[PDB]
Amino acid sequence: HRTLLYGHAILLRHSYSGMYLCCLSTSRSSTDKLAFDVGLQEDTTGEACWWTIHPASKQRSEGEKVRVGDDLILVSVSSERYLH
Amino acid sequence: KGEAIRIRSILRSLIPLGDLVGVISIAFQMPTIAKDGNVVEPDMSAGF
């Protein structure tokens, strides 16, 4: 049991499926050819599963305690793309 | 190096290969001999 911090990679397991949220790297690419899609994958290994936390609010900073109900922005480790 | 691999993959996603191939396939306009014999030279600052 670890205490979450800003700017620290986190791995999410979907409660029902048991799979892990990630960037698929395969994109329908409509409108934005550049962006990828986001979906579940079974395997834990890989930089796709991990997402980097960042403080959306200006008051919070890197390494700060994570609030219970603060707004948040997450960046994919694999391609440095936000969950958008 | 994973960082270099990620950067190259990002650039590949940015720029499609087919567009580069097509731009290379584009052909320049051609200098030609005129009737009087001089060479009409297209202004390159206004062209491909």
UniProtKB/Swiss-Prot annotation, chain A:
Linked pathology: Ventricular tachycardia, catecholaminergic polymorphic, 1, with or without atrial dysfunction and/or dilated cardiomyopathy: An arrhythmogenic disorder characterized by stress-induced, bidirectional ventricular tachycardia that may degenerate into cardiac arrest and cause sudden death. Patients present with recurrent syncope, seizures, or sudden death after physical activity or emotional stress. CPVT1 inheritance is autosomal dominant. Ventricular arrhythmias due to cardiac ryanodine receptor calcium release deficiency syndrome: An autosomal dominant arrhythmogenic disorder characterized by syncope, cardiac arrest and/or sudden unexpected death, often in association with physical exertion or acute emotional stress. Patients who survive manifest polymorphic ventricular tachycardia and ventricular fibrillation. Unlike typical catecholaminergic ventricular tachycardia, arrhythmias are not reproducible on exercise stress testing or adrenaline challenge.
Similarity comment: family membership: Belongs to the ryanodine receptor (TC 1.A.3.1) family. RYR2 subfamily.
Subcellular location: Sarcoplasmic reticulum membrane
Shown residues in whole-protein numbering: 110 to 193 of 4967
Subunit-structure text: Homotetramer. Can also form heterotetramers with RYR1 and RYR3. Interacts with FKBP1A and FKBP1B; these interactions may stabilize the channel in its closed state and prevent Ca(2+) leaks. Interacts with CALM and S100A1; these interactions regulate channel activity. Identified in a complex composed of RYR2, FKBP1B, PKA catalytic subunit, PRKAR2A, AKAP6, and the protein phosphatases PP2A and PP1. Interacts directly with FKBP1B, PKA, PP1 and PP2A. Interacts with SELENON. In cardiac muscles, identified in a complex, composed of FSD2, CMYA5 and RYR2.
Name this protein carries in UniProt: Ryanodine receptor 2
Protein induction: By TGFB1.
Tissues and organs where the protein is expressed, per its UniProt entry: Detected in heart muscle (at protein level). Heart muscle, brain (cerebellum and hippocampus) and placenta.
Organism: Homo sapiens
Known role: Cytosolic calcium-activated calcium channel that mediates the release of Ca(2+) from the sarcoplasmic reticulum into the cytosol and thereby plays a key role in triggering cardiac muscle contraction. Aberrant channel activation can lead to cardiac arrhythmia. In cardiac myocytes, calcium release is triggered by increased Ca(2+) cytosolic levels due to activation of the L-type calcium channel CACNA1C. The calcium channel activity is modulated by formation of heterotetramers with RYR3. Required for cellular calcium ion homeostasis. Required for embryonic heart development.
PTM comment text: Channel activity is modulated by phosphorylation. Phosphorylation is increased in failing heart, leading to calcium leaks and increased cytoplasmic Ca(2+) levels.
Lineage: Eukaryota, Metazoa, Chordata, Craniata, Vertebrata
Domain MIR, first and last residues per copy: 1-56
Free-text note on domains in this protein's UniProt record: The calcium release channel activity resides in the C-terminal region while the remaining part of the protein resides in the cytoplasm.
